[PDB]
Design an enzyme around this catalytic site. Structure first.
Site, mmCIF file in Angstrom:
data_model
loop_
_atom_site.group_PDB
_atom_site.id
_atom_site.type_symbol
_atom_site.label_atom_id
_atom_site.label_comp_id
_atom_site.label_asym_id
_atom_site.label_seq_id
_atom_site.Cartn_x
_atom_site.Cartn_y
_atom_site.Cartn_z
ATOM 1 C CD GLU A 6 -2.922 -1.054 -0.253
ATOM 2 O OE1 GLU A 6 -3.966 -0.293 -0.094
ATOM 3 O OE2 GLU A 6 -2.631 -1.522 -1.175
ATOM 4 C CB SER A 33 -48.492 -14.234 51.228
ATOM 5 O OG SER A 33 -47.480 -15.198 50.958
#
Length: 617
Positions: free
Chosen positions: A48, A323
């Site tokens: 590159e 409860s």
């Protein structure tokens, strides 16, 4: 000014072992430059921008020949990938060119090469070189050969066109030209080039099919989904953050260490997911387990197939308690404030009058004189109310509120009889209750469920979190309630058949009912319940399971009709507690301040005249 590659949050369990990495399963892994092998760095540079470290902002020599008809440089190549549109024609290139020179004056060559090696695309959703390697070859960079490197180096030029799975012939030829460039630029010798080019690229190529490669699987280790969504919540409730944006911190490289234990957690979501104790797909679960002693969060389930942004966390949402709260509003306060034995005889009745309201038991029929021990482990309504009226009278009108407020159970307005029994403003999350109960488990010491041990930030700071701990009840009250509630697993107990064998545990079950109006409106049978709980605890672990339904239907489809359907949460409880408890034998620590033995314990130094030796049935 954001070149930064996001670095996602890591979570660790109690062992400090990495457990989930909040990367959304994405094919991306951040790699620092120094951790990338020289060979690799070369293959890129050779392919590159060979002369990258001299350079500046394009060679100019590569714009000498290119205009002659092109090509570009890492620095600018990166600038393009700091999004410069999809239109080009010397326009992208115009800004690209200036931005390059600017970026070179703000960032070093290395930091630019790094952002390159992290951001660029490799086909099939793969961003960055570290990902490329694990994907195509299941290889860490350190141990991979030149063929592999050549190819990977080559790929980002026209990824999709060079992806081996699709265009192997094309990939071969592109790997071949990369090797040639690495040779041409003297990055490798004649020998290793001629020894590299005679290598099969498919060498350690992981074999695959199309639909696996478009399966971005965003729901992995999905067992952790809920323990994770709890981390996300607690993360932000601390000084060092809050000022900040969650969405950001989770990508700022932080490292969370939790009290999670993996195996408890797997077990729990596995059992939630694989349970058969469901009436229909609309039935819901929220379960939370935690360490009795610390209040630390060991495992947690927001529901069957819980996903995070998408689903409600049933373990951290409030639900009507039924409860469940009688030990905190009735029988516990009584022991702390007027030092009742576990035998205090209360008179059951046909019905009872508390304000302009008529209350009855579940079965309807009365049971006469009973011990509070029975009244609690069988969950009678009247004795509870009676006890709360006694407490309120002989201890303080706001005495219940202050017992319940010390265990995280806060009421905005008055605590009326409805809320004594799970009604109206008596709504709380399983997490909320698990804390409440571990207090009973651990000598009477409450611990706001905490989940984060600490977090360590990438910049070098590391914040230890704390949790609001405080003594909630005297030891005797915590001990008696504890021993009293082991009776829930005994014959006649509201959770009989679901105790575990070598393990000392207690529980209070829960059965919320609908409003009087609702029973007729939806033709719900008398024995239908809206919310069912079990809240159980050993000296090791405290677990609180809730189940309920999204929305009420006709004739009980989305209710719990009968003992056989109201029993469901106990199945989940027994299955998990059974697996995860040790049979070492540890019981609930007994103080000197208590006196006697179940069913007859009383406060040492202050005995009660109203005891009875009167059994259940």
């Amino acid at each position: 000014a954001k070149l930064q590659d996001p670095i996602p949050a890591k979570i660790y369990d109690k062992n400090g072992e990495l457990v989930k990495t909040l990367d959304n399963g994405q094919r991306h892994e951040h790699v620092n430059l120094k951790d990338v092998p020289k060979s690799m760095k070369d293959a890129v540079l050779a392919t590159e921008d060979n002369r990258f470290y001299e350079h500046g902002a394009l060679d100019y020599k590569r714009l000498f020949g290119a205009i002659g008809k092109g090509a570009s440089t890492l620095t600018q190549q990166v600038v393009k990938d700091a999004f410069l549109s999809q239109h080009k024609s010397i326009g992208r290139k115009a800004q690209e060119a200036y931005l390059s020179y600017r970026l070179e004056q703000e960032y070093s060559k290395d930091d630019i090469f790094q952002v390159y090696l992290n951001k660029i695309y490799y086909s099939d959703g793969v961003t960055g070189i570290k990902a490329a390697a694990k994907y195509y070859f299941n290889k860490d960079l350190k141990d991979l050969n030149l063929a592999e490197e050549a190819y990977l180096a080559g790929l980002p030029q026209v990824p999709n066109n060079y992806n081996i799975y699709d265009h192997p012939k094309a990939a071969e030829d592109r790997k071949n030209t990369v090797l040639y460039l690495m040779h041409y630029h003297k990055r490798i010798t004649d020998k290793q080039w001629e020894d590299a080019k005679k290598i099969d690229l498919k060498a350690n190529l992981v074999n695959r099919t199309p639909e696996e490669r478009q399966n971005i699987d965003t729901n992995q280790d999905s067992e952790y989904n809920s323990y994770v969504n709890f981390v996300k919540s607690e993360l932000m409730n601390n000084k060092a953050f809050k000022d900040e944006n969650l969405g950001n911190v989770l990508q700022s490289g932080i490292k969370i260490y939790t009290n999670m234990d993996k195996d408890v957690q797997k077990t729990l979501q596995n059992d939630v997911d694989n349970g058969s104790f469901y009436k229909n797909k609309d039935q819901q679960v929220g379960a939370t387990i935690l360490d009795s002693k610390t209040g630390g969060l060991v495992a947690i389930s927001g529901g069957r197939d819980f996903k995070d942004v998408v689903n409600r966390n049933q373990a951290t949402d409030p639900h009507p308690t039924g409860s469940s709260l009688k030990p905190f509003l009735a029988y516990g306060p009584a022991i702390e404030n007027m030092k009742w034995a576990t035998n205090h005889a209360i008179q059951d009745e046909s019905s009872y009058q508390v304000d302009g309201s008529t209350f009855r038991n579940y079965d309807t029929k009365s049971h006469g004189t009973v011990s509070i021990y029975d009244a609690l482990r069988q969950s009678f309504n009247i004795p509870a109310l009676k006890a709360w009226q006694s407490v309120k009278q002989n201890a303080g009108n706001d005495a219940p509120k202050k017992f319940a407020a010390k265990l995280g159970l806060n009421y905005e307005g008055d605590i009326g009889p409805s809320e004594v029994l799970g009604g109206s403003a008596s709504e709380f999350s399983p997490t909320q209750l698990a804390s409440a109960f571990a207090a009973i488990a651990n000598g009477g010491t409450y611990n706001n469920a905490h989940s984060i041990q600490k977090v360590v930030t990438r910049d070098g700071e590391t914040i230890e979190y704390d949790h609001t701990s405080h003594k909630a009840m005297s030891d005797y009250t915590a001990y008696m309630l504890a021993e009293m509630l082991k009776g829930t697993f005994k014959p006649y107990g509201s959770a009989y058949g679901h105790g575990v064998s070598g393990v000392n545990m207690g529980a209070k079950t829960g059965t919320g009912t609908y409003g009087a109006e609702t029973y007729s409106q939806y033709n719900l049978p008398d024995n239908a319940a809206k919310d069912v709980w079990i809240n159980g605890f050993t000296p090791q672990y405290t677990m609180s399971v809730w189940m309920g339904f999204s929305k009420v239907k006709q004739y009980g489809e989305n209710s719990f009709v009968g003992h056989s359907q109201q029993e469901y949460p106990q199945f989940l409880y027994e299955n998990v507690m059974s697996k995860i408890s040790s049979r070492d034998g540890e019981d609930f620590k007994r103080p000197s301040s208590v006196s006697g033995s179940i069913p007859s314990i009383n406060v040492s130094g202050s005995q009660d005249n109203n005891t009875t030796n009167r059994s259940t049935h």
